Amino acid sequence: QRQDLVLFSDQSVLPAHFFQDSNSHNLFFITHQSCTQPLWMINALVETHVLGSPSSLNEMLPSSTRSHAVLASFIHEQNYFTNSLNKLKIPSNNYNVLDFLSDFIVNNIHNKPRDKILSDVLAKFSAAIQNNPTDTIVIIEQPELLLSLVSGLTCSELNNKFITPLLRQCKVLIIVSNSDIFNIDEYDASVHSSNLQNFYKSSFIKSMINLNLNPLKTAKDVTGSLHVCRGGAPIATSNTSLHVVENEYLYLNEKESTKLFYR
Amino acid sequence: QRQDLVLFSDQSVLPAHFFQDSNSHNLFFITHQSCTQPLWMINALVETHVLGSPSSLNMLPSSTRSHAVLASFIHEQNYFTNSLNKLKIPSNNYNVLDFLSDFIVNNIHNKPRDKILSDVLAKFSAAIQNNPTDTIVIIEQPELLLSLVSGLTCSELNNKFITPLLRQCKVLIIVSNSDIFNIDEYDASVHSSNLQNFYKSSFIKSMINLNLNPLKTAKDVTGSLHVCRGGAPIATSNTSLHVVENEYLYLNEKESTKLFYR
Amino acid sequence: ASSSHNPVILLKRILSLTESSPFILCLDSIAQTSYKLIQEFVHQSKSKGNEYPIVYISFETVNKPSYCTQFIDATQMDFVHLVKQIISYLPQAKKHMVIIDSLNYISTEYITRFLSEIASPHCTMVATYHKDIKDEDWNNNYPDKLTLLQFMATTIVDIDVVLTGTLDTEEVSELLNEFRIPRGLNNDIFQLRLVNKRKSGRSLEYDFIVNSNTHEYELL
Amino acid sequence: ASSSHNPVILLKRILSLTESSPFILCLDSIAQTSYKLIQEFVHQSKSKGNEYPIVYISFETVNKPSYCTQFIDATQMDFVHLVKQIISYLPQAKKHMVIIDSLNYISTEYITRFLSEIASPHCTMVATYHKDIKDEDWNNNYPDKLTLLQFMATTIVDIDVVLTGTLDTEEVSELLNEFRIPRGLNNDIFQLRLVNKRKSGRSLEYDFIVNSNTHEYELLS
Amino acid sequence: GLDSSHVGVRPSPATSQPTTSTGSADLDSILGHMGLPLGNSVLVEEQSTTEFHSILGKLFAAQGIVHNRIRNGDTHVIVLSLNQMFAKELPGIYYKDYNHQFDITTRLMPAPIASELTFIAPTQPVSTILSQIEQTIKRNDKKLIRIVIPSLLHPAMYPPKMFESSEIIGLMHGVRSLVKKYYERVVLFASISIDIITPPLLVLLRNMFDSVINLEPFNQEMTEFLERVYKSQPGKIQHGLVHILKLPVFTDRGEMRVLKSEWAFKNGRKKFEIEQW
Amino acid sequence: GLDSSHVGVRPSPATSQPTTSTGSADLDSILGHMGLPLGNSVLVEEQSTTEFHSILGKLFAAQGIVHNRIRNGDTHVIVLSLNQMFAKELPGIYYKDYNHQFDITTRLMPAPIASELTFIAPTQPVSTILSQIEQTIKRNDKKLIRIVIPSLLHPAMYPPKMFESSEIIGLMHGVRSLVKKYYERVVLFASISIDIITPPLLVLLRNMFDSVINLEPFNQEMTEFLERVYKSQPGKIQHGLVHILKLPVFTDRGEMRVLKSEWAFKNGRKKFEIEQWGIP
């Protein structure tokens, strides 16, 4: 019944060699609709990197590691993740949360040029990564919100001045975005919300793997589906056999616990 | 076989009472594709007003006060002068305003939209000022201004030129090229909306619409002329006057035109 | 109670300005313009014995209508002056009808201001919007003009042509798309869709055939 | 003579940069990106014994490709500087390949200028345009970017996904419209449409199935 | 934070976290927590031209004033609106004192005073609105804070400039920041007529709120039908459907809580009900 | 005006008005006047990526130079282009002297001199282009004037700013003004690749010209087919269709002269033909 989460052909979720190879940069792109939110996937990834496996999903002793996670959100405050991760017993010294909800508009936006806004955000990331450069994952939730919060910001400026530099500084970057804009009935996201839609397309193109959560189109037994798919870019890896193991899982999330299983 | 041109229920083309009623203003809107051009219709209208009937379509020396002001944004003065001479219209009964010749070069070097329109209008006003109540005005392809003048909207063209012009005329005849609506695979509505608005608004203000078109379905026939109500009532004391809607086929060749029925 | 007993009588009450509607929005197109419906308004609002002063605002009408008490040429003057002028012709005192020949000429972002400066307990505004005249950035989410107008209106009357000949609706549609204007349009007999927005907030819809010659309205 | 005897051999000659094409335009989409085709270029242009220096221009590539001789990060610097830099890596002297990862990042009204400053008898440019990334007045009649790019190109290679599963093309289309990305995309085996614009001016079209694993190309419709 | 026995606060039966009433018992039940948990917001959307949502907004504010006036239940109400009459329209009364049954036909006696309710004009710059909201929150430091935004984006009240994404979405993001920053004391209620909201803006707005409830009034046919069926029992006629699109806490942690056409609402003579449909 | 015996001018068989050769006898015939009547323009449009139209532009200019060099036939050629090599590419010769059979494989000897042909850069402001055209027309006051615009709006040569309607359509309107102002001495030839021209701009451009001819090269299939059919007779293979959209004088007075797929063109080794089209 219950399945383990597997992303890659070596049976791993977050390959340790993604952090030992060097000059390598890999982007995971996770998309979800707003009725199938990703908190449990975010936690599981942090769990994987820090504790060593996605135990909340697959199934343990005190352990110690250098492995570190930088967590950023444009829609959730710091307490949200701090509480979530405490409940999973992730050691607070193995992660850092960057809050781009709290006071963000009143500080970082109001009366301030686009370029300076983006440069300041990036600087917060750089400071965070600077400590543990090669054993750190970076997770960033809803950066596309900047396209709405910042007057006249184009997708290409967001990528050129923030996303791409960020990725160039990371072993592994995980972008988490809300795909509601593609799911309005009678409305063509391509034509009319092109600035916003470009972000999802370009993110996909740069990623080596795409995880997407959606409600089913066709039970109380099931929250939705998780698809695991190749992204548009090759995996940056010495291991020439490493590939994405594409998959579809159904999952049920309830009472703060999640179970993956097959159709 | 051959039919006379008839526009209105009193059997007329250009009712003399359109020039005797006062404070009345009436707009004819003529549209045509570029393969079925309107020169012969323009001439016939001038003929009707000045000589008294559309003889080229349907004679002794005569004299009249009736006057025609002819303007074009696409044809030079010689074009109409030659055309009308061939019909024996007396040169003292018409005036041609040329907005092709030197038009662009007299209107660049940063001449503002407002001044461009005001100058055009002023030429019309000066022309009409002479024979105010016995004059028809014919204006060919004014929509070209929407392309010639940077940033000119349909509403500015109407507010600052067309509508004031019409407010000064007993009878105004706008002649426009409808090619923009006839591109295969292309929606004039969505993409050329500024231009398309001119044709819709002109229609709305007109009491009659004459349409010239190639057939969709012979060497026997150039095209069809449709006569249709416009979007506005006829301004007239005669409460019985109405447009007699019609379809004519026509053949234009050797500088002569014949209307007939399908 | 939830829908009209006699929709024709409701229609007549709206036409006669007995029933209160401070903003009545008429929608028309080249196939059937609004001026005949406007004529029905003045007719019914005199045939029940009313005698309202009528202020006529003209962006595109050169012939002064016979029924109007005041006429304003809006084509030369700006927005502020126009509002000033309209108000200067308005007021308890008596009931006035304010007719605007076309709302297409007022910029979308000025619509709500226009309706709010003119509004009054003694004013009913009757205004036409041409559905086929197109309005003149990417994170600008303000509603389009038609959407907004319909939202602000207390009554909507949407006018359509009634076809008598051999062309059906879609054929006439493609012809009009090529500006090959057909015979049989702009008739004395035409179709009306009424949306009456009640005090309760509910919007009720009814279809009518209207004969502007005899002033007989029937239901569809 | 009017159409290719062996289109596969033509294809290979273009891939190997033997046949001259100063501007080769690759069209791709999220269902099948271009980097595999690019790999085919470098492969064929080494497997016929060539040894071209390759200048790689990156608007969206953070991992320096192994085959490249020079690498330029275009994301921080402006248009003039970028052109300067590209030229400074270019030259009779020898044959260079200039690869741009995405033409979507260059403003439409700069395209012709870009192509004209870079052009040279020793330069072949290979550039990718993403068909599904939208460009960033009403009497402006300048062609859209794709139309212009296709007009300027001497060779066009239009890449499409080849579907193996149970979803047909239109199903995958609607799924992609909802960003419900399906399995079975971005494969080693994919479809190619070649438009070769001859010296005579005539543009000739051929379809291929390409296996980027074995480097075997076969013909289609 | 709050007094530990603040009459307006109880544990959520689902998560035990501090929760407060919306003023409507049926809405409280619908939200899944016997109320709206503190540190969260609710958006009530309405289809068509009716404004049933105005009742809910009024209950939300009235409930707060009644708490403030009671034991203790110190509460301050913040209304983002131009319509100052909102305060004069709040209903009177028909875990004791957690929730009251209000009578919409009646009125608070006396009407809210200046220290109980504060108005903020939405025609001001976003930075100013956010500044004034926070200062009012801080000035009332040991009070439960109810922020109410009746008819968000009504075009008679919100100027065109506010419809720019960076303006309205900036505003909501800043307000969301506050609700989360003062999670111990603050809740937010907003209502909106969605028919004139462009789709992309609607998706962004939903994204700013922790819960979303959609009201669908019965169309003309259905209304006629009901009026026929209950000819003899007019008190049984319902007025539309209530759709649940998003629920506080549950949705954010990953549950699929969308539920359409399962609840119906009825505007009673005095009382607003939501029952199985 | 012109010398009354200018070798380049004859009466139109249709209207008797003064008419001059395009340099192509078959095109002259197609236009309906055994040439292009003076005071008129012709637009040659081409579909696809081929440039057969370049031949026509070259003939139009070469004809003029041959007249100038002959009796009298004083002619000055005005070329609106950045491509100065156009002048070095004009063909040599294979109502006497009205029209010549040119050989595209050969070249004028000697090449056009500065007093015979003038270049004007299309990258200049519209007002300047119009000023220079008129001054050249006036300076050459008793000469037949041939204005040639090869590859109008080619994006390699025309900057984006020129694609604004007020710019390009202004230009054409101003040029039309000149052709009509000096109707006794001036003709205009322009060519354009229409595939990248947006529809509305194309309709406006057609509206500025007195005649419009559209060249449609045979697609891949059709070309293969012909190459099969005339395997043994390669000299018979034709290269595309010629569509007539608008003709000088006739169209403006009200005639429906549109005629599609009735003519085909063939680029010979030395000679450009347009003959009746029949699917072989």
Coordinates of N, CA, C and O in Angstrom, one line a residue, chain D residues 18 49 90 97 138:
Chain D
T18 N 29.9 21.8 -41.7 CA 30.6 21.7 -43.0 C 29.8 22.7 -44.0 O 30.4 23.6 -44.4
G49 N 35.8 15.3 -37.8 CA 37.2 15.8 -37.6 C 37.4 17.2 -37.4 O 38.5 17.7 -37.2
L90 N 36.1 36.5 -31.2 CA 36.1 36.1 -32.6 C 37.1 36.8 -33.5 O 37.6 37.9 -33.2
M97 N 32.1 28.6 -33.6 CA 30.6 28.4 -33.4 C 30.2 29.3 -32.2 O 30.8 29.3 -31.2
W138 N -0.3 50.8 -31.3 CA -1.2 50.2 -32.2 C -0.9 50.4 -33.7 O -1.5 49.7 -34.5

